[PDB]
Amino acid sequence: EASRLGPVFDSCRANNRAALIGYLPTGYPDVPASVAAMTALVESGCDIIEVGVPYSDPGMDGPTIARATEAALRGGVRVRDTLAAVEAISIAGGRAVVMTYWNPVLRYGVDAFARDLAAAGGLGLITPDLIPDEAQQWLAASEEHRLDRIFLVAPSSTPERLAATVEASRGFVYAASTSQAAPELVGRVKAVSDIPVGVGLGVRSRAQAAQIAQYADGVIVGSALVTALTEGLPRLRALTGELAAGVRL
Amino acid sequence: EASRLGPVFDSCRANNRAALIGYLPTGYPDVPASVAAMTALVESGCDIIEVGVPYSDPGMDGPTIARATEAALRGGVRVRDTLAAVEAISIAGGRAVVMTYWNPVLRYGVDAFARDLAAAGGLGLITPDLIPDEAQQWLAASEEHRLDRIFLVAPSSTPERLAATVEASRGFVYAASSQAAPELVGRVKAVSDIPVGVGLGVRSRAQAAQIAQYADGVIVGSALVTALTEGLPRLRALTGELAAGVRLG
Amino acid sequence: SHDPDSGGHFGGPSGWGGRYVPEALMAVIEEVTAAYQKERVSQDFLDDLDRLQANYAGRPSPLYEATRLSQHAGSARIFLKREDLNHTGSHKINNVLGQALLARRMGKTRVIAETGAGQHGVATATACALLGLDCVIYMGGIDTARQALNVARMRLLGAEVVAVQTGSKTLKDAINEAFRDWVANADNTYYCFGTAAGPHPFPTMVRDFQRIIGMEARVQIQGQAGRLPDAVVACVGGGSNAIGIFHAFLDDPGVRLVGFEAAGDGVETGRHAATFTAGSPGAFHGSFSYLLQDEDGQTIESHSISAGLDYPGVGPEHAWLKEAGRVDYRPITDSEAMDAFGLLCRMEGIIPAIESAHAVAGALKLGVELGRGAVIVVNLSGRGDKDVETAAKWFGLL
Amino acid sequence: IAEPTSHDPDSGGHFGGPSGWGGRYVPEALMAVIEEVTAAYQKERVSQDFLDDLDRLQANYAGRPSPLYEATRLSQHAGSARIFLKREDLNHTGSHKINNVLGQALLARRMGKTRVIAETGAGQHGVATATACALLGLDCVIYMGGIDTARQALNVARMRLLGAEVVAVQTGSKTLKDAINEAFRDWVANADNTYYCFGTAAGPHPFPTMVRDFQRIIGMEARVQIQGQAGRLPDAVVACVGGGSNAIGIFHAFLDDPGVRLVGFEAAGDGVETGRHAATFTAGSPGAFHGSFSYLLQDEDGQTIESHSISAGLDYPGVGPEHAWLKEAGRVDYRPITDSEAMDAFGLLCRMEGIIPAIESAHAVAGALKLGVELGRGAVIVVNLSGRGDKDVETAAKWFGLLGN
Numbered sequence A: 001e002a003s004r005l006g007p008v009f010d011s012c013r014a015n016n017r018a019a020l021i022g023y024l025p026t027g028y029p030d031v032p033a034s035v036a037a038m039t040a041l042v043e044s045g046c047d048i049i050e051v052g053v054p055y056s057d058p059g060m061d062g063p064t065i066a067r068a069t070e071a072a073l074r075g076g077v078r079v080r081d082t083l084a085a086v087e088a089i090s091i092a093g094g095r096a097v098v099m100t101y102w103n104p105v106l107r108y109g110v111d112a113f114a115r116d117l118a119a120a121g122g123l124g125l126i127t128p129d130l131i132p133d134e135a136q137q138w139l140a141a142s143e144e145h146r147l148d149r150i151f152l153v154a155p156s157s158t159p160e161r162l163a164a165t166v167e168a169s170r171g172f173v174y175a176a177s178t179s180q181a182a183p184e185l186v187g188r189v190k191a192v193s194d195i196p197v198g199v200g201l202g203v204r205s206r207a208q209a210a211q212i213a214q215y216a217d218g219v220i221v222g223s224a225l226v227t228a229l230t231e232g233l234p235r236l237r238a239l240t241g242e243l244a245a246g247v248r249l
Numbered sequence B: 001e002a003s004r005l006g007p008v009f010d011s012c013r014a015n016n017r018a019a020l021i022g023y024l025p026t027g028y029p030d031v032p033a034s035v036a037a038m039t040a041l042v043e044s045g046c047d048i049i050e051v052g053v054p055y056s057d058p059g060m061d062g063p064t065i066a067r068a069t070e071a072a073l074r075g076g077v078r079v080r081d082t083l084a085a086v087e088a089i090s091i092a093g094g095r096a097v098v099m100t101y102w103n104p105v106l107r108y109g110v111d112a113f114a115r116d117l118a119a120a121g122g123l124g125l126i127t128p129d130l131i132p133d134e135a136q137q138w139l140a141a142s143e144e145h146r147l148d149r150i151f152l153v154a155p156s157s158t159p160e161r162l163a164a165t166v167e168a169s170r171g172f173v174y175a176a177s178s179q180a181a182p183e184l185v186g187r188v189k190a191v192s193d194i195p196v197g198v199g200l201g202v203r204s205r206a207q208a209a210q211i212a213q214y215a216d217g218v219i220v221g222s223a224l225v226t227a228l229t230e231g232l233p234r235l236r237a238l239t240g241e242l243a244a245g246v247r248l249g
Numbered sequence C: 001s002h003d004p005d006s007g008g009h010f011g012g013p014s015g016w017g018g019r020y021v022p023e024a025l026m027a028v029i030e031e032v033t034a035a036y037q038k039e040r041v042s043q044d045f046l047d048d049l050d051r052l053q054a055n056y057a058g059r060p061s062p063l064y065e066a067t068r069l070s071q072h073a074g075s076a077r078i079f080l081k082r083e084d085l086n087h088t089g090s091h092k093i094n095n096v097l098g099q100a101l102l103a104r105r106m107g108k109t110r111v112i113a114e115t116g117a118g119q120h121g122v123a124t125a126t127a128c129a130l131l132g133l134d135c136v137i138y139m140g141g142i143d144t145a146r147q148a149l150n151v152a153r154m155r156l157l158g159a160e161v162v163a164v165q166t167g168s169k170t171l172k173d174a175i176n177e178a179f180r181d182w183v184a185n186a187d188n189t190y191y192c193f194g195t196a197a198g199p200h201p202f203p204t205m206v207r208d209f210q211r212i213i214g215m216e217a218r219v220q221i222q223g224q225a226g227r228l229p230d231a232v233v234a235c236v237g238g239g240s241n242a243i244g245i246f247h248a249f250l251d252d253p254g255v256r257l258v259g260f261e262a263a264g265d266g267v268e269t270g271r272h273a274a275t276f277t278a279g280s281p282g283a284f285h286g287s288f289s290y291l292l293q294d295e296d297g298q299t300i301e302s303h304s305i306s307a308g309l310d311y312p313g314v315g316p317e318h319a320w321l322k323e324a325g326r327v328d329y330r331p332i333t334d335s336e337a338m339d340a341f342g343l344l345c346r347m348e349g350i351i352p353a354i355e356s357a358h359a360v361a362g363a364l365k366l367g368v369e370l371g372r373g374a375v376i377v378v379n380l381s382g383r384g385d386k387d388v389e390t391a392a393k394w395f396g397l398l
Numbered sequence D: 001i002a003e004p005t006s007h008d009p010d011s012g013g014h015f016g017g018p019s020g021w022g023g024r025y026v027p028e029a030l031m032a033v034i035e036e037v038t039a040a041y042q043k044e045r046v047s048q049d050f051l052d053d054l055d056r057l058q059a060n061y062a063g064r065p066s067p068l069y070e071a072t073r074l075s076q077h078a079g080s081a082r083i084f085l086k087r088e089d090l091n092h093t094g095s096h097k098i099n100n101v102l103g104q105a106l107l108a109r110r111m112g113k114t115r116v117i118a119e120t121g122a123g124q125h126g127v128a129t130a131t132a133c134a135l136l137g138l139d140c141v142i143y144m145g146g147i148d149t150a151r152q153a154l155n156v157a158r159m160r161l162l163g164a165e166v167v168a169v170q171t172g173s174k175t176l177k178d179a180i181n182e183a184f185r186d187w188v189a190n191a192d193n194t195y196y197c198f199g200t201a202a203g204p205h206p207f208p209t210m211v212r213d214f215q216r217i218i219g220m221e222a223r224v225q226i227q228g229q230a231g232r233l234p235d236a237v238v239a240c241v242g243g244g245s246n247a248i249g250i251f252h253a254f255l256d257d258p259g260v261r262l263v264g265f266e267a268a269g270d271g272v273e274t275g276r277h278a279a280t281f282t283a284g285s286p287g288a289f290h291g292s293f294s295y296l297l298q299d300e301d302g303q304t305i306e307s308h309s310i311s312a313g314l315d316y317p318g319v320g321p322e323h324a325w326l327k328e329a330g331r332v333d334y335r336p337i338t339d340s341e342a343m344d345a346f347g348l349l350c351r352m353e354g355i356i357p358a359i360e361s362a363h364a365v366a367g368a369l370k371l372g373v374e375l376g377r378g379a380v381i382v383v384n385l386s387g388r389g390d391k392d393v394e395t396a397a398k399w400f401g402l403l404g405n
């Protein structure tokens, strides 16, 4: 009945804060270095980790994440490396969902990928190029293997499509928006549903995270974590510490 | 009435020889030098001189003569310089006709050119791009100013067109051209007693003598231009050899 | 009858086509679809398009019996559907006129489009100049640096051109960047996509704008030959020219349909663009269709001497027709294509596009197979003026 | 059906009298083969089977009829006149020159000739001729100057892909004339098997009449089309004028329509006052040139003056004799258009209608815009768009600063 991420957003709202949701791509700068970074997010205060599956044609990603995923693919990263990362995070006590474009999932086998994500301790899937309209197989696999399904909404979303995307989502809805567009989009979700809402808005600072925690249930950070890891692992730790404190404001 | 050049061929035929007909273009390598060359031809035994008017678009000029006419035009040669060359040749005891494409005559005035050429001592006109079919103004000018009119015939000329070209010619008829040349001269003899000049890229005593067996005139041009280019002594020596060639006995 | 369902799926549960796009693009995709559904049955729109097809683009294109090829095709009779004579020099003009008229009917003031070596960019800039639309072409940086004159054509036509330096800097990345533009600028922008692929409505809409090739061809061949052909063939990149010519013949059961796709150095060499012969099913550029991809589903580098057939995907309607057994898809190498290019030049005085030469090469082989007197219609998708330099190098004439 | 011969010359090829325009100012050496082509053309122009053959190629191979397009977005720049473009830019090979070469190459096969020769400057007529020879299985030889050859590498390679032999003439000035000179002489030597395919409505008789007859189709189609779209005959029909094939081809059908103004536009280069132009009628005078009595650019002695134009096809110091006759008779006006006027029109046509014209054709567009201003709102002007501008993209891009340095 309850979603897998339901308890995490309960714990956050009980402690007067939003959830810090941190994205990193598998295999950047290489596979072991990327797992050390994902484990260091759990140690540094991330509540949920988005494990990125590098894709050769990531249309919704900007050049910070795209160049990292290109480097990861040049280094020979494989989809299976993403499931090993999900296991390393779970064993370290963290809470992991996967963000992936749909073709790698189709190529794996949808049912097979969901089974194997579940067996790794993975709690859900974020699906930026899968809409509920094409999600028949995914809905079946999601129920079967008890994974959350985080669909995206946008500022342009029609009233009818927003309600349906929200109704098809479990765990949280990703309000993607990359001044007042983000909080209005969050308001439009709240008017039809009490499902948690995460907001990505190119956050790079403590102050930016605090502003988003005032209305959104989750603060999603991606690009800035990748930029930090490029400088070094201690820069990632320090930046994650600043964001973990931002969400408590 | 008889042609202007009739008495030259009469005189050659009585001495068992062909007339040597020598071409040089006005203004090659410059104007005074061309006049000195034309004079030297008269002194070295040329019976008739063809004074060429350089023209920008000559169809019937081989490479040697084309380069030479191009050079003459680059040096500023004028149609009036051809008239002056005619006077110099008349002054030196020579006999001159002018060889010219038709547009310079048209530009000058057809009647005007015939009058001024006649006044200069000119005996006739060789018209390589004027056929009898377009010659109405020229026949009238030719009759008025007592100029000979030398049209060309060719190996490919039809019987009808050959007879028309021979009938329209006065002085001689230019047979421009294996055995194709004596066959062509033979075809002219069959319809007319008019003297026939043969051009055949002649450059030696022996070639002039071959042609003198069957033709009344031996026309030489390219080889005179090639010789002059070397110098005036080479031209004198070559003309001397060609004059010996036309004489059979 | 041959149309997809309302979601854009061909063949029901196989699920070819569809919409594999983010939610961010769906407002404008529903808008284009509603607009297209409205204008396809509007007499004013079809009249406008027909008037432009006739007076501006030069339609109908002729069908030409290439009698001097016959001896090189087993004495079969090769008829060339001459799309090479259209304004701009290819079939692409058919597509961009339809989409640009739609853009203006929708109230959009800006049109974007992708291009490889320049053909679709030039075609799109042509239709935007005609209709007064603002035009921005996206082109991979590897292509812009070696296609300066096509960039200049586009600029002379009033279009802007953007060199795309992201990803692998070639066609697929130009499409990815045009996609990102359209996500941000959908209010005022229309994406004029250049083949029969992409999410619903693009495969259906592009095909409908290209159907005219087949409708004319079917009439002209009955007129000239006295019967339907034994085969109709075409080269296949994304699939627009093939589907255009094939569509009118789909319910003629005695007409063989063969799509010829680029095999590069050979299918066995890993340097090809043979999407059906060597690819596999997946979601790419908005559609579930065939795709050149590795084991994890990552897109791989395509290779052909032809730039127009260099696209690693293929349209979903073709995937459906392959599954149903209606159309066969066969590989043609660079060598076979260039031999046919040269032969069409020497025999008929027609310089084909290198893309189109794949179809001619395929027709020569089919002729030998079918034998004397067989009637083969070939879509001559473009002229080869753009390919003179490539062909001259191949044959050692420079 | 063979069309009436009311505007034709006499049997000597003269327009306007027995010593008027045209004729044959050529050497006796060429006359046998000229009489052979003239008789062959007399026979075949009245042959229904020849005209069926030509029409069948015109239709299925070359793509005729070309359309007539109302360029509504040019109207504002032409004084609100209505500019209709006769679209020869859509012909196979991209110009009107295909109409000529198809006719003459058919005629060569009828005459028993196995081999065709021609010459070319920039290369357009060489490609057109090589195209027609490949189609009809004729051996093709194109004569081109070495200066033209080395600066037109792609057109040379086009001709070779088409199976033609290209002969780079490396003697004299190595340009158009040394090529011609060698072609003329090739013809004489191999006359029993060789036909000479001449590229414009000029030369000795029968070439001006024959070439014009193979281009009459443009004006015939256009006369029908404009009455369909405009509802009436046009106020004017205009065209660019090199040697004059495309202009005479569109003009002819309108000759006896007394309300229709006919205007030829010629290349003024940098300006008629600069001596870098090809404004044959504007600055030239009557004379014998390239086989005919017509107008040419000539100096005080009658030497031919080098012409200049940004366009290759209009860069010719002469003009066909039928145009000379029509000028003397007051039926057609001929006006100069500069490089700049033409290039402005080129760019304008690209931006407004999406048609990239040949720079030759842009002179006609440029002139059509000025005539639209003079004639005014609602006037109907048909413009011959003689070719497409793909060959001219590099020249234009340079002009408009689109390449840089």
Ligand SMILES: N#C[C@@H]1N[C@@H](CO)[C@H]1c1ccc(-c2ccccc2F)cc1
Residues within 6 Å of the ligand: A057, A058, A059, A060, A101, A128, A129, C020, C021, C022, C025, C175, C176, C179, C191, C193, C197, C198, C199, C202, C283, C284, C285, C286
């Ligand atoms: N997110 C997401 C998807 N990862 C990219 C690769 O597929 C991106 C994408 C790119 C292009 C298209 C597209 C193609 C043709 C017409 C209209 C379109 F929108 C769709 C999606």
Ligand SMILES: N#C[C@@H]1N[C@@H](CO)[C@H]1c1ccc(-c2ccccc2F)cc1
Residues within 6 Å of the ligand: B057, B058, B059, B060, B128, B129, D025, D026, D027, D030, D184, D196, D198, D202, D203, D204, D207, D289, D290, D291
């Ligand atoms: N002598 C002489 C004339 N000077 C040359 C150029 O003026 C030469 C000439 C040669 C050939 C032609 C010609 C042109 C078109 C079709 C057929 C032809 F034969 C015209 C002139």
